[PDB]
C-alpha cells in the first residue's frame, strides 16, 4: 500500500504525486512495476546526476535532491514507456471524491 | 561519467575531488550509497514531472530524505553528506 507507505498523492511539496488506484494498491506487484522502477535512478546516478542539499528545520535534518532523467526515445518501447509515465504522473486529480 | 560539479540546474553539486577520481571505490561510498532511494521510495516519495524540449523528453523529480536521528553514526553521516555537498566551492 503505497499511500500507507509514503503518504496520500496529492499537490503539496511534501506530497508524492506519482501513482494510479492500482499502483497505489499493488504496490511493487503491479503488472508495470518493472517498466517504471527501470527509470529510478542506481545509487551512483542519484548523487551523480541530481542536486543534492541538506536543510535542518523542526521536523528534523532533511536530505533534499532535484534532478532529471532523459528517456531514451531511440528505444523500441519509447512510446509505450512515456505514456505509462504519463498515467501515473498526478493521477490522484482523476480519483473519485470521498464526500 | 555525469559532468562536471558546479551551481548549474543541469549539473550535479554532490562529490569532493577524492569521490569525483576514486568514483565507487572511494573508501566511503557505502556509506553515501545509503542514503540513495529505491525504486519505490524514489516513485513512492518524490514529486515526478515530465518535460519535452529539444533535446528529448525528461523525467523530473523533487523530493527529500529524513535522516535518522536515533542512528548512532548520525553525527558521521551529516559531516560525510556534508562534506561533499557543494564541495566544488572549496577546489582552489
Known amino acids: 500500500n503505497v499511500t500507507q507507505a509514503f503518504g496520500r ?3 503539496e511539496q511534501t506530497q ?7 499502483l497505489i494498491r499493488q504496490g511493487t ?4 512495476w518493472p517498466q517504471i522502477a527501470q527509470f529510478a535512478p542506481s545509487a551512483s546516478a ?3 546526476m541530481s542536486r543534492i542539499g541538506m536543510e ?3 521536523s528534523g535534518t532533511w536530505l533534499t535532491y532535484t534532478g532529471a532523467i532523459k528517456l531514451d ?3 523500441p518501447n519509447f512510446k509505450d514507456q512515456v505514456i505509462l509515465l ?3 504522473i498526478d493521477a490522484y ?3 473519485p471524491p470521498t464526500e
Open 29 to 32: 506487484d503491479y503488472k508495470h
Open 46 to 48: 542519484f548523487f551523480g
Open 16 to 22: 508524492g504525486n506519482f501513482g494510479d488506484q492500482e
Open 56 to 58: 535542518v528545520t523542526p
Open 86 to 88: 504519463n498515467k501515473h
Open 9 to 11: 498523492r496529492g499537490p
Open 93 to 95: 486529480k482523476t480519483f
Open 73 to 75: 526515445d531511440k528505444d
